[PDB]
């Protein structure tokens, strides 16, 4: 028995029907691929080292390397998709909406997506110290982040032809559960 309430990603993953097929677009170190063992997840990340770390940490994990937008995931094949803290790294509104649409394209008609981004309510375009191994030395550089304001993520979803099912706030992040729009 767990006593603490589940965080939203764990909650969402545990709510998936048994034997659902899912995609983790920007899986990072595979942190969430093991939350629900009744479920089959294909994880991807743009980072070759993060994926490797994901694989080493659990070789049962199914992880691949690909861009989050121009990805390797077949359209409309998946029961669910998670995108946790990845699309706030794209620096044009155009490419942020593209990323959302990519997430949506992944889904079966009844498929659902969780998208999770840094909130402004923590200027929206910022620089954040970030560690990067280069020639064996861990340098500290700056990487781009877009902080999201209220309803901005639902806007990006609706503009992508998605439907917003639920919205919340958690630990300085905006999240949305969304699905394809009843069109498509």
């Amino acid at each position: 028995t767990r006593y603490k309430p589940w965080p939203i990603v764990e909650k969402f993953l545990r709510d998936q029907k048994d034997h659902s097929v899912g995609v983790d677009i920007g899986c990072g170190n595979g942190k969430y691929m093991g939350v629900n063992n009744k479920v089959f997840i294909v994880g991807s990340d743009r980072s070759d080292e993060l994926v490797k770390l994901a694989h080493d940490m659990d070789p049962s994990r199914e992880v691949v390397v690909c861009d989050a937008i121009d990805n390797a995931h077949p359209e409309g094949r998946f029961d669910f998709a998670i995108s946790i803290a990845v699309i706030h790294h794209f620096s044009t509104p155009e490419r942020r909406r593209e990323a959302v649409r990519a997430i949506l394209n992944t889904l079966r008609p009844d498929g659902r997506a969780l998208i999770y981004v840094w909130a402004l309510e923590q200027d929206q375009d910022v620089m954040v110290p970030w560690v990067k191994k280069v020639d064996g030395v861990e340098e500290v550089r700056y990487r781009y982040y877009h902080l999201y304001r209220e309803g901005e993520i639902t806007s990006d979803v609706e503009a992508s032809g998605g439907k917003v099912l639920e919205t919340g706030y958690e630990k300085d992040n905006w999240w949305v559960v969304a699905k394809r729009g009843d069109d498509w």
Partner: protein
């Protein structure tokens, strides 16, 4: 890189995707392995409803396997004795055989991606 994953993976080229040629990639394996995994007939039968059976056969062919039903098995009793042979053999192929080293050629753009210990990579 479980064999199953082949069925959930396609070329990342915007053109092959735009023109319905991304899926499926044709596969060759310089190396393979079997890794023990818990057997779940119920999960296997569910998966059948998320699998492109046509594409599944092709990739099995490209990897040198014709031991595979012509079309999607119609199973309603996952625990039935009658389906255990076919299910065990599906678990063996789909879940337990992993590619460690191999390639994934797209037949529309020409490009060849690599699977190396044991990660598929889909970058230009």
């Amino acid at each position: 890189m479980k064999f199953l994953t082949s069925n959930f993976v396609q070329c990342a080229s915007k053109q092959c995707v735009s023109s319905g040629n991304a899926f499926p990639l044709t596969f060759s394996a310089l190396e393979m392995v079997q890794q023990e995994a818990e057997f779940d007939p119920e999960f296997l039968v569910s998966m059948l409803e998320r699998i492109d059976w046509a594409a599944l056969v092709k990739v099995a062919n490209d990897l040198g396997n014709e031991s595979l039903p012509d079309v999607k098995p119609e199973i309603d009793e996952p625990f039935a004795e009658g389906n255990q042979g076919l299910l065990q053999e599906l678990h063996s192929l789909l879940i337990e055989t992993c590619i460690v080293e191999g390639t994934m050629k797209c037949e529309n753009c020409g490009h060849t991606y690599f699977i190396k210990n044991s990660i598929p990579n889909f970058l230009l």
